[PDB]
Amino acid sequence: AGAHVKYRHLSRSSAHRQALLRNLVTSLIKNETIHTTYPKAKEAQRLAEKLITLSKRDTETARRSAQGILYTPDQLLPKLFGEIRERYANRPGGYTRVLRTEPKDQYSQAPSAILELVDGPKDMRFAMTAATVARDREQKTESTDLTKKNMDKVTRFRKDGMRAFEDMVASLRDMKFTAGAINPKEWKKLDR
Amino acid sequence: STHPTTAIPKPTTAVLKTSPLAEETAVELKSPSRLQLKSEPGNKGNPKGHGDRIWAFHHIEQGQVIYSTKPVISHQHLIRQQPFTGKNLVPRKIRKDYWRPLAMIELAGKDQGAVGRSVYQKLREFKKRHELDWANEAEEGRKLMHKSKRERGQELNDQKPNSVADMAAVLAGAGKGNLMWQVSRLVKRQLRRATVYWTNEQDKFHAREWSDNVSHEVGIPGEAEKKRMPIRMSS
Amino acid sequence: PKKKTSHMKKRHRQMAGKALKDVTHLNRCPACGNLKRMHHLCSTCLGKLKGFMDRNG
Amino acid sequence: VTRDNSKQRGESALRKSGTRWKLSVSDEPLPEPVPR
Amino acid sequence: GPRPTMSGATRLVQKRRHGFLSRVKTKNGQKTLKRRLAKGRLRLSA
Amino acid sequence: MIQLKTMLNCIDNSGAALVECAMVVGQKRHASIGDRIVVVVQKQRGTKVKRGDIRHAVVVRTKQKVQRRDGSVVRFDDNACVLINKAGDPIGSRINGVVGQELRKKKWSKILSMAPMQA
RNA sequence: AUAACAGUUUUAUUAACCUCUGGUUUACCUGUUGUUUAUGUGCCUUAGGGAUGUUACCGUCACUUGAGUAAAUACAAUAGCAUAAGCAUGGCAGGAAAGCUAAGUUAGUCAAAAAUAA
RNA sequence: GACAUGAGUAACAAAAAAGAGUUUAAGGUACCUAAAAGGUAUCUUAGAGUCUCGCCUAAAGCUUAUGGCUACGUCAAGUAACGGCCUCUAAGUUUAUAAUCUGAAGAUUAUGACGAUGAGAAAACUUUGGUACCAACAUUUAAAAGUGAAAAUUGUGCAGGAAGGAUAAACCGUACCUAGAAUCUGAAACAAGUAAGCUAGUAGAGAAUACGAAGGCGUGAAUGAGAUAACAAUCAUAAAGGAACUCGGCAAACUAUACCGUAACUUAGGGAUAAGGAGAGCAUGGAAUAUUGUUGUACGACUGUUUAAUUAAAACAAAGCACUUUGCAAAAAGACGAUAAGUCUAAGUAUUGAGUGUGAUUUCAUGUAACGAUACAACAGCUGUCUCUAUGAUUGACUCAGUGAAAUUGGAA
RNA sequence: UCUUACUAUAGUCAGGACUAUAAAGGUCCGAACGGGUUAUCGUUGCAAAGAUAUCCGAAGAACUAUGGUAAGCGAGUGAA
Ligand SMILES: [K+]
Ligand SMILES: [K+]
Ligand SMILES: [Mg+2]
Ligand SMILES: [Mg+2]
Ligand SMILES: [Mg+2]
Ligand SMILES: [Mg+2]
Ligand SMILES: [Mg+2]
Ligand SMILES: [Mg+2]
Ligand SMILES: [Mg+2]
Ligand SMILES: [Mg+2]
Ligand SMILES: [Mg+2]
Ligand SMILES: [Mg+2]
Ligand SMILES: [Mg+2]
Ligand SMILES: [Mg+2]
Ligand SMILES: [Mg+2]
Ligand SMILES: [Mg+2]
Ligand SMILES: [Mg+2]
Ligand SMILES: [Mg+2]
Ligand SMILES: [Mg+2]
Ligand SMILES: [Mg+2]
Ligand SMILES: [Mg+2]
Ligand SMILES: [Mg+2]
Ligand SMILES: [Mg+2]
Ligand SMILES: [Mg+2]
Ligand SMILES: [Mg+2]
Ligand SMILES: [Mg+2]
Ligand SMILES: [Mg+2]
Ligand SMILES: [Mg+2]
Ligand SMILES: [Mg+2]
Ligand SMILES: [Mg+2]
Ligand SMILES: [Mg+2]
Ligand SMILES: [Mg+2]
Ligand SMILES: [Mg+2]
Ligand SMILES: [Mg+2]
Ligand SMILES: [Mg+2]
Ligand SMILES: [Mg+2]
Ligand SMILES: [Mg+2]
Ligand SMILES: [Mg+2]
Ligand SMILES: [Mg+2]
Ligand SMILES: [Mg+2]
Ligand SMILES: [Mg+2]
Ligand SMILES: [Mg+2]
Ligand SMILES: [Mg+2]
Ligand SMILES: [Mg+2]
Ligand SMILES: [Mg+2]
Ligand SMILES: [Mg+2]
Ligand SMILES: [Mg+2]
Ligand SMILES: [Mg+2]
Ligand SMILES: [Mg+2]
Ligand SMILES: [Mg+2]
Ligand SMILES: [Zn+2]
């Protein structure tokens, strides 16, 4: 009867919902990635992109508001205004990437996702795009336009850029990571 | 607020290497204290005889240790020396059929009780740092952090092997402000003589090495009268 | 209930429009070629790449 | 009164909290015994 | 309805009321024993 | 917004100090500034009106905010009124206070001829 | 004939709508009480001494404090202070846009015809 | 007895609460690899732990009882730091003996035995009756100070406060569980119930209220993830009005320190905290204290008791008062005894006991002070009771995954 | 072993206020504890008598623990 919801309530109390979002944003910085449900990964994505925006401000108020979101500031603030601030210095927003994944809990079959920091040590799209390039080179195939489009996304703002991407490809081929990969030319002849 | 230490090599004041982590030995971390550079420290403000001897009692089944200045422990010692290590793991009282004298330390100076009151302090400060701040056993040795909270509380109670290693350390000058050191400062220093009485000869082998100022004797005064015979290795 | 529901009127309620829908939004995975849901990450390559970034780095 | 009357504040053995204050034996490596 | 009439019950009052010695030692208790004994009861009391 | 059981102030020299509204005359909506009502005298001031006399009154002041056609919104600190007879002729002869400006458009020249102040 | 200015109903009901007037505001800003946690900082004196704090002992039937007796120390210190958060109805208090809303605004009834009754 | 229907529906909602990593064992899959193996990843089952968040906290913590369909390596001469067994006895029990009464069964009295919820030498080594007593209350006392016990000292009030004995180490208990997270009682894994000690600190008069150190927990998938309609429950706020609601102010809201001054009435104690004057920014700020107030009637003096689990009251009781009865010489009257001996009355004696009605006092049924979760009326305030509802919050309702009822049903297009 | 009365042996009642007392009161406010006034929910309930709030007593005719006695032709106990 009243207004629509401004955001997801996630079937929690007010205080319980503010702590759930501060914990996902704390694990995101500490671990560079988290595997949770999709509605949780989409609600923390807005709070993690606003916390990295405070890390790009030179005022003290931003340094005090960053302390009021994390749960171990003494141990995580140096990383926020250090490595992370330098990483996202030149990026105009969009510092997080939420990727849908198969259920993390098979009991409830609740749709899950992966919230990660772009251009990070655990960027799952930078590695999945490196595995595609690794297979293509190792099977004499031609990369698709979507692979070329993802290859530039994961190397435009990254510090090393292409050099760090070619090293990942080299490490995935010397390990034989693409062994047993179904060639893209035999996908139309497969049923199972 | 508490501050836990890390299992990192450090320098020792003792003459021996108490633990493999010890880097150096007999290092002066602070100028000698008032009573350290004193040939005859005295029983200034304590009863006659106090400090001449120190006893150690242990739970023969679980391994919990208690240090006492008198020949008998009371309900105070069990409360002020045994921290909470889990439900059903802190006894509610002292059961005479379980607690036995582990060892007894007697100093050469028959009236310098101030040296024993210092040895007693380092033993009680080392035991608190064994039940708490056990970072050297979290991932090595007993691996207390790889155990359940139930099994972790049982190993934290088994302070008998640790207590015998605190004796070889304290009686070798470990600690800062230990009065077992004797500095002449004419500047040569040495350790005061001591004697440890053991109810079990095999119990003195928990310390990897004992100092050269401690003499080991079997049998504690008053234990034979109780029809308790000492355990000898040679037999 | 006034009467017992017959085999006909109970079979209408149970199966008329309640047939399980076949999932048709399936695509292959670029890195390995295994079947996955559309717009979703491969579950066998996620774990393998997720574990490959934990050993060496 | 400036003293803290809760002597063992934030002090636990199961969780390896560490000593509340700095002792005279806190700068030395814990003596490791020979196991049973 | 039924009440929790056995809350706080002790097993000392169970032996004093329905025990074996409360029955062999009384004229009316010897009948209960013989009846339960003639029926085949294993639990003659308590 | 004046309803039944509402207590208002009498700002005319009629001898009434505190009246209670008993009926909104001619309408179902609650009386606002310039509306006719029937009140019951509850107090007096030390042919006056005795306590308990039922008379008609006009609302001149309302604590409820009133929006004019130009977007001006007026609010007073209390509800007041002036006692009138069923004819529409002020029982009193002089008003002591400020009345709302909505009496001008509702043809209350008689109340406005007693030189009341306006807001 | 122009130009400028001024004046041109009420009640009820139905629906829509938030420009206005208010109400609400549970992840907004500000102020603030009690208490806890983390981080930083933190007394005097000439690295030493002292104040506060710490550990052990002494002592009591037992517990706490003080003296006394030893030692360490802001290096991992006391009280205090700074920042931040938690809990106490969203802790409370003052405001508050959007959305929803009436008591608010606007509109129909309040344009019109045919065939009929007495 | 089996199998249907409701129905794959209700339910798994104590207003604590979860989040992201890590790891062990056994087993299922996919790839690697085709020498089996091993390796990488993943899932199932059964566990464990780390970091963060929150909840209880004079507990939902610890130590122990009653108890136990939880599990069997739980270890003592005694004290410090232990109970039972054992000795002694109370209320009582007695198919013990003696006497006595008695249709049988049995009952009475005395003695004996038995019977804890009580009393029991020593130990940090040990084996008469106030010259009183160990009920309640109060006071004092292990000498640096404070606090809590223990025991004793002194005292106070009346309601006048046990019994008896003394004074070289056997046998039995010892595990776990204490009810918010797997154990007791409630038919059960039940939002109920159950005994004792301890139960950080801050702040307080306090065991109030608030926070919470340690600890425990945030259930055995007996669930989890979404979404945030109607409606329901539990709440928050609210323009103007302020009981217009309603059988009825039901519910909700208001009500707010060692201070100056206090009435009628009164059993002279009270009424009485009467009333009336007052304690940097919007606020000296949260929680609790904290509740409508005042006045006047009816009934009952008062505090109490009552239909466990629909009636808490005007009913019962009550102190006070009145009346009848009881002289104790063998049985005082009264009550009890298939029915007696005999027991209570009572180790009492007409100011004793029993029975009956009344229900303090005042006036002799009636009028006041005081008191009431009694009934009723008025007055003031207060508020969503209402004009007239709106919005916000949580939990259900709704959808997905897991588990899976019931009343009901002659047969049904 | 519920419950009513009695009985023996024991325990418990934070703090404050008033009153003639240090202690003499079926005194006062209010926790523990004991009650169950009003409303709401619940009614195949968490519960075959519960939850929430509110309310009453809380040094007494009080409450609680472990035993004991008294019940079914007659009626045990009963502030009824
Ligand atoms: K007979
Ligand atoms: K009271
Ligand atoms: Mg839910
Ligand atoms: Mg809150
Ligand atoms: Mg035990
Ligand atoms: Mg019954
Ligand atoms: Mg009972
Ligand atoms: Mg007009
Ligand atoms: Mg609007
Ligand atoms: Mg707008
Ligand atoms: Mg904020
Ligand atoms: Mg907290
Ligand atoms: Mg709390
Ligand atoms: Mg506000
Ligand atoms: Mg608005
Ligand atoms: Mg028109
Ligand atoms: Mg016509
Ligand atoms: Mg249905
Ligand atoms: Mg339904
Ligand atoms: Mg459901
Ligand atoms: Mg496997
Ligand atoms: Mg409390
Ligand atoms: Mg059971
Ligand atoms: Mg024994
Ligand atoms: Mg006997
Ligand atoms: Mg006993
Ligand atoms: Mg329960
Ligand atoms: Mg409970
Ligand atoms: Mg049960
Ligand atoms: Mg527990
Ligand atoms: Mg959980
Ligand atoms: Mg209002
Ligand atoms: Mg208002
Ligand atoms: Mg009406
Ligand atoms: Mg009315
Ligand atoms: Mg009410
Ligand atoms: Mg009465
Ligand atoms: Mg009843
Ligand atoms: Mg009732
Ligand atoms: Mg009379
Ligand atoms: Mg007679
Ligand atoms: Mg009468
Ligand atoms: Mg009468
Ligand atoms: Mg009463
Ligand atoms: Mg389902
Ligand atoms: Mg009973
Ligand atoms: Mg009283
Ligand atoms: Mg009272
Ligand atoms: Mg009752
Ligand atoms: Mg219902
Ligand atoms: Zn793949």
Coordinates of C-alpha atoms in Angstrom, one line a residue, chain A residues 19 40 67 81 85 90 112 143 159:
Chain A
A19 CA 26.4 -5.3 10.0
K40 CA 24.0 -10.1 -0.9
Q67 CA 36.9 3.8 9.6
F81 CA 44.3 4.2 1.4
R85 CA 43.9 3.8 -3.6
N90 CA 42.6 6.5 -12.8
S112 CA 25.0 -17.3 -5.9
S143 CA 39.6 -15.9 -30.6
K159 CA 49.2 -1.6 -14.0

